[PDB]
Amino acid sequence: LAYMEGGALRSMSDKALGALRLAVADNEHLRDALRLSEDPKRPERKVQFFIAVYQHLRERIRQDIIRTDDPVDAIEQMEIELARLTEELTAREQKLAI
Amino acid sequence: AIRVTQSDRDLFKHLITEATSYVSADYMRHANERRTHLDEALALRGELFG
Amino acid sequence: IQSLTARAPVWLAAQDTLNQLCEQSGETLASSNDVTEYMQQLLEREREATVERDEVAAQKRELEKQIERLSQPSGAEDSRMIALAERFGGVLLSEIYDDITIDDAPYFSALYGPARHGIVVPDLSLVRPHLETLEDCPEDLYLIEGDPQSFDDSVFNAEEQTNAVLVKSSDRQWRYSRYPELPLFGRAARENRLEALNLERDALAERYATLSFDVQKIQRAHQAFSQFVGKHLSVAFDTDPEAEIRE
Amino acid sequence: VERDEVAAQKRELEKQIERLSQPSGAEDSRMIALAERFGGVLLSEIYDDITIDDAPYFSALYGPARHGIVVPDLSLVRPHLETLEDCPEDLYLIEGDPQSFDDSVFNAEEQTNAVLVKSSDRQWRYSRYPELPLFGRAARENRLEALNLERDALAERYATLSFDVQKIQRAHQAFSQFVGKHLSVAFDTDPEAEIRE
């Protein structure tokens, strides 16, 4: 992004915020943090919001089947699980009984 | 199982993307603003001194 | 400077994707040829992991088939035998010996030999008309005559020996059966053995799960590298523009 | 992936053919040793040459007893019986002349594609006609050749797939070299016009 003008950066930021408002509608902690983040004169608030998001995700990982703490890395494991489960779903068809 | 994992993956993948973009774009905009301020300071300093 | 500036963003995007990709792997890439050789090593790991996966799958299939033979109703060649048991006024022999103890089970299994899973039918002439119709049955069907409710020991020319039994089946014919372990009859503890088999098959299922996961991981890694080269080589491994612009 | 698949199937066929150890189709040597230990001969060895047309009928007739020793005495076995431990778990023995083996005692009655045998008092045995009978083997070379035909078909398919993969890899190397040495100028316009200007 270093080789872009500020107008494009603001456009992306605004559209991302538009998506976030809907994504985070139900939660309250994240909603409060996002609310606090939008004053341009206090930048660290945005990174604090980011930290809140990451922690919130880490609680929801369900490590019974997954081990990565970083969610971004956990995406690949969910993808692998989908592929493997779809493969197991194939067929057996040895059906014969009383 | 495929249903549950599908829901979890969709949620993660969308929320993480929006959070990351929203935060990082502003971070870089601040970096560029600081660079512009430094350039302005040096230019006006140079011509003032000369 | 204008040329370098136009070129820069593409090179930077390419570098970020490359760093993510190689860091995701254990080895660090440095050139196009290097990436290709890494492709080849990835293929070799695919075709090894798949072999172990398939072999474990074969063992698991054998285990389920073995377990299934011991299931129902009195574990036997159940596919046709149950219908064949009711289509004549008879009872399955293995079912008559459902209750026998573990100590007499090997003896009886040796005694009855292949005929363990025959049917008891007290006349054997009433089947003679039905018989021509049997086109759907095990390749060797055994029939015995006696009272199904209080069946007497079939007249065998039997003779007990050390850990074995001798029998005269016919004039000028004898059979000699050695005591097996974990027999057919006594289908009370044969549930004990299928319990042992369930415990055995659990491990195969677990191991197969891990191997399949590994194969999928390798396949997706190859997909990632292919996607990369599809979208990336135009500027891969080129010299850094930040440096030259600074200069 | 496909050439590896074909190689695996060809291994399976080769394993199946190898399982035809001796002479063509494996026969248990332990039974030969047992036939040596008692005066007699292995039954399949006696009927190994019967016609393929009647072979399924005979195999249906004998049932499990197909693998057994023809001992005309039955006096040598009984003393040695308690001495037998390595033998197959269900050993079968028949009495008759090994050189000219008279029909075994079966009250056999022939049904449509099946046989019925009154084995003993209060016992009948019923069997259907199989294929690949133990008798009338004649080495069953035709099955070995059918398996060889299948194996050679798999080998040929494997050869074609290996050749195809080699072609594809060569094309890949060509492209790698090209983007390594001409990509910087690929698809650009002719400079002579600009030079003229």
CB distance B19–A9 less than 8 Å? no
Q: How far apart are the first and last CA of chain A?
A: 68
Say if A3 is an interface residue toward chain C (CB within 8 Å): yes
Report A:69-98 residues touching C (Cβ under 8 A): 76, 79-80, 83-84, 87-88, 96, 98
**Burial of D65: CB neighbours in 10 Å, binned 0-12, 13-18, 19+:** buried
Chains that touch A (3 or more CB pairs under 8 A): B, C
CA distances from residue B5 to A77, B2, B10 in whole angstroms, order as listed: 10, 5, 9
The answer to whether C246 is a known ligand-binding residue is: yes
| Contact check, Cβ <8 Å, C9/A3 | yes
Instruction: For residue D151, give the nearest of D24, D14, D44 by alpha carbon.
Output: D14
Q: Name D26's Cβ contacts closer than 8 Å, sequence gap at least 6.
A: D19, D20
What stretches of chain A show up as alpha helix (H) in DSSP?
A: 6-23, 29-37, 44-59, 71-88
Q: Give the CA angle between residues C160, C162, C168 to the nearest 5°.
A: 35
Write down the residue that tokens 């820069």 correspond to.
C8
The residues facing C166 across adjacent strands are C159, C176
Nearest CA to B25 among A70, A39, A16?
A16
Beta-bridge partners for D116: D109, D126
Experimental method: cryo-EM
Which helix (DSSP H) or strand (DSSP E) does residue D93 occupy? Answer: strand D90-94
Q: Is there a contact between B29 and A10 if contact means CB atoms under 8 Å apart?
A: yes
Instruction: Closest CB to B18: pick one of A2, A19, A86.
Output: A19
**SS3 for C139?**
coil
Place of tokens 């963003």: C9
Distance of CA D147 to CAs D2, D13, D19, D22, D153, Å? 21, 7, 12, 16, 10
Place of tokens 């809140």: A52
Name the token pair of D64.
Answer: 């499990």
Question: Is C171 in the D-facing interface, judged by CB distances under 8 Å?
Answer: yes
Rounded distance between C-alpha atoms, residue D142 and residue D152, angstroms: 15
Q: Which two tokens stand for residue C105?
A: 């089970």
The CA-based angle C63-C65-C67, given to 5 degrees, is 70
- Residue A36 CA from chain centroid, whole number: 20
- Which residues of D make up each annotated binding site for (R)-4'-phosphopantetheine? 196
Nearest CA to C190 among C123, C92, C64, C100?
C100
Q: Is B32 on the interface with A (CB under 8 A)?
A: yes
| Residue D118, helix vs strand vs coil | strand
The minimal CB distance from B23 to the residues A50, A79, A82 is found for A50
